[model samples]
Target: MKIAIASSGTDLGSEVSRFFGRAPYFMIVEMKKGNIESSEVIENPSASASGGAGIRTAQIIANNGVKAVIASSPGPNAFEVLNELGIKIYRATGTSVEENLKLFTEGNLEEIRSPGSGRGRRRR
Candidate 1:
């Protein structure tokens, strides 16, 4: 399984970022039999975008063939895109990416059923 995690830094030791769309990095990981097979950290190109960063970030995740997402919160538009693509959204738990991955592999993370309203920020 392939998963994408919103991250603040470039490794599995990095904390899961609070801003799904504005996260500085994405830890794309490939899992095999409940363990990390391989992983890559990609810089978030849409992090500083002028508009529609959330949906665009979703597209980037989809393009990477990620089957699930682990994030603190995803904006409504991004959530919709991920749902349309049949990608599951999991709420982030634990402190670091590796910890969250272990929790997820053990079925400990909860799926996020609703999207954030995203009223706390503006582009202008």
Candidate 2:
């Protein structure tokens, strides 16, 4: 299983997913094999007024074959879309990536129904 964590500079769970420019890259960890792959940051390209960044994030995960997501908070749309596609999630706060991932693997992670259900950000 692959898990993606929003990160600022590739630190373990130290980054937030609010702004795309600052939180460019995501940490993709392979669970079964215990390896990590950091994806190339897909620069958000759209009218800032629209939630283009969120859509970009979703696209990256889908296109890259990520199966899980870990974040402090995710917009309602992003959450639902990912879930519908069979990607699991862990609603975490103030935990390092490594720690959170361990929690996930141990089946001690917290799961929340995304408020973004049925409301994906604009995709164009």
Candidate 3:
């Protein structure tokens, strides 16, 4: 299965980014039996968007054929889009990409069930 992880850098050792839409990079990994078979990193094109980054990021993930995503926090827009695409969302915050993946394999990460206010939204 293929999964997308919000990351601060391109490597597994890099920290998992706390904000999904604004994450610097996304690590895409293919796993078989909890073992990673292949992996690659891609820049987050939505990171610097003026608005609606989450929606754009969700599209990016969906386009990649990812079945799931791991992130510290996912905003309402991305959550809705991902849910519509049938992608599972999991919490894997405050850790390296490798560590988060381990948590996922061990079933320790929490599943995101509802959408919350997205990052970068201004308070009125």
Candidate 4:
């Protein structure tokens, strides 16, 4: 499986970015037969919102074949677009990129891509 993580810096140890669409760069990790290969940061083409950032970011992700995304938070429209593109999301806050990646590799994370996951039962 392939996964993408948004980080505050260029490396895996960096704090995860809160917004996936507006993140500075995305670390795309490809996993096959338990081995991992990484791609250099895929610079976000729409880091600024003045040019319809969400839509632009979605286009970039689609072109990159990202099947899953890990981030701290996501806005309604951007989340919707990601969902429509079949990209799974994991809501991770105050978590670093490596931490999220660990949870994912260990199969300990939940899918919270949809905007409705944080309903009445949410703890955050």
- Tens digits of lDDT, candidate 2, 26-117: 66666565534443333334425565464456666667666776665545555666676666755656546566666666767666543445
lDDT minimum window of 10 residues, candidate 2: 13-22
Q: What are the runs in model 2 whose C-alpha is more than 4 Å off?
A: 12-22, 33-51, 112-124
Q: In terms of TM-score, how similar is model 1 to the real structure?
A: 0.75
Instruction: State the lDDT at 44 in candidate 3.
Output: 59
Q: How far does residue 80 in candidate 1 sit from its true spot (Å)?
A: 2.3
**Candidate order by TM-score, highest to lowest?**
1, 3, 4, 2
Query: What's the number of clashes in each of the models?
Result: 0, 5, 0, 0
The 0-to-1 C-alpha lDDT of every candidate, in the order given, reads 0.71, 0.57, 0.70, 0.65
**True-structure RMSD for candidate 4:** 7.7
Task: Identify the runs in model 1 with alpha carbons over 4 angstroms from their true place.
Answer: 112-124
Model 2: C-alpha RMSD to truth?
8.5
Let me know the TM-score candidate 3 reaches against the reference structure. 0.74
